[PDB]
Amino acid sequence: GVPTYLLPGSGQFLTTDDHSSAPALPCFNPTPEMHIPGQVRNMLEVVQVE
Amino acid sequence: GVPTYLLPGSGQFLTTDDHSSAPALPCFNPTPEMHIPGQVRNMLEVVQVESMMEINNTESAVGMERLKVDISALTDVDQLLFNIPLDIQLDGPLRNTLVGNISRYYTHWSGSLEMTFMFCGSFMATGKLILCYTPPGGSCPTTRETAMLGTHIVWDFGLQSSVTLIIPWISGSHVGYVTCFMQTNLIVPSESSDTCSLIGFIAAKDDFSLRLMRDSPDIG
Amino acid sequence: GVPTYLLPGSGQFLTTDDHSSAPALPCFNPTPEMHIPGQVRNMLEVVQVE
Amino acid sequence: FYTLKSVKWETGSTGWWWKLPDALNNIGMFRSGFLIHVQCNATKFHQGALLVVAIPEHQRGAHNTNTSPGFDDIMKGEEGGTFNHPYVLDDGTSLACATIFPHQWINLRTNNSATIVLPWMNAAPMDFPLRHNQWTLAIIPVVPLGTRTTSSMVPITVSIAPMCCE
Amino acid sequence: VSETLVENFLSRAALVSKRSFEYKNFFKWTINTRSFVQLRRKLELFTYLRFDAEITILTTVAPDLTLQAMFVPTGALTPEKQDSFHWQSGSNASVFFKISDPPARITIPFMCINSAYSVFYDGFAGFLYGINPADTIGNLCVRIVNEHQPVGFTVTVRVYMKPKHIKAWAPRPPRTLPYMSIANANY
Amino acid sequence: VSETLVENFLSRAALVSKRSFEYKNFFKWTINTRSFVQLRRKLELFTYLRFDAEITILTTVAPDLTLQAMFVPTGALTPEKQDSFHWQSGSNASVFFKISDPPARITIPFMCINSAYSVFYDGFAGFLYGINPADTIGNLCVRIVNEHQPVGFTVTVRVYMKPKHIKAWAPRPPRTLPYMSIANANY
Amino acid sequence: VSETLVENFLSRAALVSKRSFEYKNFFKWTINTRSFVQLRRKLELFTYLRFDAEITILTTVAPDLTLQAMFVPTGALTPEKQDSFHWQSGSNASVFFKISDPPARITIPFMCINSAYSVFYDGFAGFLYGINPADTIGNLCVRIVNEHQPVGFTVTVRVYMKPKHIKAWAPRPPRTLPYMSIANANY
């Protein structure tokens, strides 16, 4: 086995960091996408509307 | 040594995730495979097999007398015989079917169904029947003169002993009817018995799909 | 540091699994091999003897 | 290519089951590919249907008790038993879903013959034929018969032929 | 600007539920996201959107107690007594976690039958106004798994939600008057 | 569709056994899978199948107690007293785990002498109806390893089973009448 | 067949020693492998063999106690009192482990001066029958490192041995009569 040691900051819970999560229902297919008009990606497309 | 730190969610125990496990008996050989016929890999190969259904949904019918209907010559003229509500999660004529008992496990379903009827009287007997299908947006016609408006087929035992009826598909989101009508009076010879019989089959087509798995309420 | 999380089954002690072990005396030389006759490798060589 | 004793099917009849390895055991014997031919005969005036099915590993169950069945009730042998309750196949599995097994329909209007080829189906390559009932040939009358008069004989005859028994 | 994307605009990971119980005995919270008016107003700006949950359950007590948290989707039955046989069913996601460990984490994928969640539904179900039957997700039931120690317990549970993998559609003007209830949008 | 494969259809990982013991002293459970009628009916649909076990033992007590869980295959002897010399034998899989740690996990490979488990056996052994002598797997005996502290203990053990690597043969119609016993299929 | 190799035939990892001590105070066990008659008979089948030890010490108590386990090879001195200055010597392998942690593990390489261990020695040392002076390995002395808490302790130590990297020579017929002692092979 590979040796290791814990850094300070282990076991804490931030609220802003992003990590992978364990799925609840593996091998479950969501319903697929569909081209719905009016998709917005950035909020600066909102503020340019008069 | 490499440094590390524990994410939140360590040491928990889910019941659905898959991971490798430590073996109990390492370097132990199982007995090898052998080509046993009838191997199934996907459960949609099960539901495409046709199965009988309970046509005679009336009360006081116990046992294997729920699978057939009677059409006596002296009794009925221009009378409807049966109807099938197309509600698989709900009780009725389709509860004890092979397409029914699988799809109680799953909760979302969509796919085209196929129904096959079969006559079982004598060689001599003839007579006509019509099979009106009604979409869920329309009411089930209880009169024949309104029943010719919907999609129907004129079935004649005599010339043909069986019939295939394709149902257009609709998903289950939160109802459709397949009804029958006696076209003409049954005529039989003097030697054969008067009472004949019908049997209805059901089998899903290949676009039948299931999405979300749950436990079954069928068994206690 | 690399992030990680513990699977269920950590810290247990099986008796059949094989893993690497920390040596007691590192950089210690054993006495070398020598061709001793009658070496057996598999136990089916024993049962074939009448 | 052996033949069995012909049975009489009437209105009150309710089913028949043979155990294939056993029912054929008591005739001149001690990899087996079974072939089964079932043929009844009637005139054009009779009517009715059957259901010839060959259920593998069919484990029966005693009605409304806790006692497992015995040596004589299971291995009747070469006579063939009768279903006490054909609608639940004597084990609770419904007859309506029984078409998953290899089966053919004898409908007296259309035809009066059925033929099922049964291959060797066991996990072990060897089998004890005195202590194991491999297949169970079962015929079940779904729609009973009827004439103007009382019921007729309409005899049914099962013909079994193995290949490469040992 | 990497800051103002919609995938970054709704990833706050705020609290949604906090209800304790003293040693009815088990905690059942519906998954409707209209709990706090801070997060609710940020979802008023879009008509249709699509995401996943990433639930985190944080637990503090006032002791080596074990907790079970079971997720139940829509259509399946929900338990009513703590030792019911619905808890023993394995057709639903359950997680077993202690108190001394770091808190549990589980993500819930997109489970509407349409292409997106309908935040606003100008229509009726059956025959209710503003209730889409394909919108709701389910509920998570949290019980404890121990024989109760006859001492002073106070088990308080906090639930956090980080909606990620956001896609949005049809931006809408924000709400300026305060809310009346959580069933509809009165003023 | 990735959902409806047989390898995914029988991988529920449900509970099979839960029997506590108070401080006879050790827990011995047979490995027959016909414990709960929910899992038993899902195995009625197939004639022959082949899998492995992946046992998980979850333990909660009502304290730094150490537990031994020993697996015993068929043909070998099973212990009858807690301090017997069968527990000291090393020709069988044992695992030593605490309570404070995350729960133990061990998988049991396919150990029938045939090509698959025979769920239904229309035949007799020796001379029993419906008992295949090559079908059974063994049993796991769980004892504690401590001198008993003379205080109020309540050690409750839960065992979970995830059958994976499934292969199936010969689909069969499901059962509609409820069970009478677990020895056979009466009604 | 991967099952019946000699490297797989003697890798059982069984128990060899179990002797507790109550709070002389420290546990000293010789490393002779002729402890249990189950493992001893499996070593009767071969004349000369060669391996390494892989000791595992499992410790349960009836509390955050720290344990020292020191290995002493042959020729070096062994301690007689718990606080002796032989424990402070650093010319021998020592391991410091707690109770709450998972148990300690240490492997001991092949340390005979010949090419293999002589299980049977038809000869004399000096001037004893059946004692080869190059056969013995040493002994491990296990003490505790704490000031004793004046309460009821019961510290029980179990030692396991997995001989791996096996090579064997000259197979021999097994023993059928039971043993008289562990010094020789009387009957």
Q: Return Rg of chain E in Å.
A: 18 Å
Estimate the global geometry of chain E from the Cα principal axes.
globular
Beta-strand content estimate of chain A: 5-15%
Pattern of helices and strands of chain E: HEEHEEEEEEEEE
**Major beta sheet summary of chain A:** none
Terminal Cα separation of chain E, in Å?
36 Å
In order across it, which strands form the biggest sheet of chain E? 1-10-4-7
The general outline of chain A is: flat
Subcellular location (chain D): Host cytoplasm; Virion
Family (chain D): Belongs to the picornaviruses polyprotein family.
Subunit structure (chain D): Interacts with capsid protein VP1 and capsid protein VP3 to form heterotrimeric protomers.
Domain Picornavirus capsid (chain D): 1-145
Explain what this protein looks like in three dimensions.
- This is part of a larger assembly, with 3 copies of chain A, 1 copy of chain D (166 residues) and 3 copies of chain E (187 residues).
- With 50 residues, chain A is mostly loops.
- Chain A is built from 1 helix and 2 strands; from the N terminus they run ββα.
- Chain A starts with a strand and ends with a helix.
- Chain D is mainly β and 166 residues long.
- Helices cover 5% and strands 22% of the residues of chain D.
- Chain D has a 4-stranded antiparallel β-sheet, with no helix packed on it. In chain D, strands 2-7-4-5 form a 4-stranded antiparallel β-sheet.
- The longest helix of chain D has 4 residues, at 20-23.
- With 187 residues, chain E is mostly beta strands.
- Chain E has a single domain (1-187), classed as Jelly Rolls (Sandwich), CATH 2.60.120.20.
- In chain E, the strands form 3 sheets. Chain E has a 4-stranded antiparallel β-sheet with strand order 1-10-4-7, with no helix packed on it. In chain E, strands 2-9-5-6 form a 4-stranded antiparallel β-sheet, with no helix packed on it. Chain E has a 3-stranded antiparallel β-sheet with strand order 8-3-11.
- The radius of gyration of chain E is 18 Å and the shape is globular.
- Classes of the chains: A little secondary structure (50), D mainly beta (166), E mainly beta (187).
- Chain F binds chain G through residues 64, 66, 88-91, 96, 100-101, 145-149, and chain G through 12-15, 36, 38-39, 58, 60-63, 99-100, 102-103, 154, 156.
- Chains E, F, G: This is Genome polyprotein.
- Chains E, F, G: It is found in: Host cytoplasmic vesicle membrane; Host nucleus; Virion.
